Structures are given as structure tokens and as C-alpha cells.
Amino acid sequence: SQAIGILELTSIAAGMELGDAMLKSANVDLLVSKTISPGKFLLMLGGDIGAIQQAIETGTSQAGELLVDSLVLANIHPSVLPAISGLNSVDKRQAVGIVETWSVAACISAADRAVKGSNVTLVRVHMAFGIGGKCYMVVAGDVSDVALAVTVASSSAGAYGLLVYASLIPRPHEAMWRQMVEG
């Protein structure tokens, strides 16, 4: 029902002007607004499909040659957006699943598939260094729910040859729990 808008610019100045412009243009949520090395700027938006398409169109149009990349990931589960913008709350210490991918796009799709495919909590979708680099999604819940989530997410990523590794941590320890679930 929802959507992810990705707009990567070759300029920070352009990114901020365009980012502001996109927020005013429709009812969109800015999930990410950061500089990536070696000078590129990243804008990540959440919201209803039409709003995202309108913002990304306004963005790309105004962007001109400053546009590095623009992507619209459609039909995303609601939980995915806050997992991109920050963290989703975990009710209790249970099993943890981590699926590592190449590209935020692949990670988002894996996360989405996991969310539909199970009763897990999608804790967060992390980007180590920009849109094409190592990304990981963290899921929490029953060992069985986490196993299903992990297999589903791995298969999603693996299908596009962008799966790095996926792990299941039943009964994680404190140090790790805080580090996996809270960042």
C-alpha cells in the first residue's frame, strides 16, 4: 500500500533544496537525508504510492544532470518505512535474524518479503555506505518465525544474486542484543 522513494544527487546543496521541495510537494516522509562519500547526497522518502511518484518525478525533473539515481520501490509493508527511518520496537528478547545484502533496494525487498512471509518484527533496515553498498535488515521473534523470515528474505536477495549472508541468533546475548536491535 505504501512506497519508498530513492533520490541520489551529485550535490549536497541540490539535495537539500530538492529534499525540501519534495517534502512540500506531497504528503511524503523524509526517511533519510544524508551525504554519502565521495560527495553524493541521498534522499529516502516514505509515503503513499502516488505521493512518492509525484515527489520522485518533481525531484528528478528539478535534479537535471545532478541526478545520480532515482528509484521507486512500490507495494511496501508499513513497518518497512520506520525500519528505514530508525528502529521498530521489540516487545521481548527472543531470536534475532540478520539478512545482509548488496544494495538498499535488495534489502528493502527482502525485508518486505520477510514481513509479509512471517509474524516477525522488522527491527531495522541499515545502510552501511549508500544505495549500492552492504545493507542489512534485522528481524526479531520466535526461532520458527525468525527462521521463516530469514529463508524468505535470503531467497528474495539470492534470486537477484545480491545476498551476502544471513544468520539466525536464537537466544542472543546482551552485548549483542543491544548491538543488533538498538544499533
Binding partner of 74, given a copy of itself, Cl ion, none, CB within 5-8 angstroms per partner class: none
Sole binder of a copy of itself in the list 66, 71, 72, 73 (CB under 8 A):
66
In the complex, the smallest distance separating the C-beta of residue 138 from a copy of itself, rounded to whole angstroms, is: 9
Sole binder of a copy of itself in the list 68, 99, 114, 125 (CB under 8 A):
99
Q: 125-129: long-range contacts (C-beta < 8 A, 24 or more apart)?
A: 125/80, 125/83, 125/84, 126/183, 127/32, 129/36, 129/37
Query: Which parts of the chain are beta strand (E)?
Result: 2-9, 28-35, 41-48, 67-76, 95-102, 121-127, 134-141, 163-169
CA atoms of 18 and 63, how far apart (whole Å): 7
CA atoms of 111 and 159, how far apart (whole Å): 14
Sole binder of a copy of itself in the list 50, 75, 116, 176 (CB under 8 A):
176
Residue 86 interacts with Cl ion (CB under 5 A): yes or no:
no
Which residues bind to a copy of itself, rule: CB under 8 A?
11-14, 16-17, 19-20, 23-24, 30, 33, 35, 37-39, 62-66, 97-100, 128-129, 133-134, 136, 143-144, 147-148, 150-152, 154-155, 158-169, 172-173, 175-176, 179-180
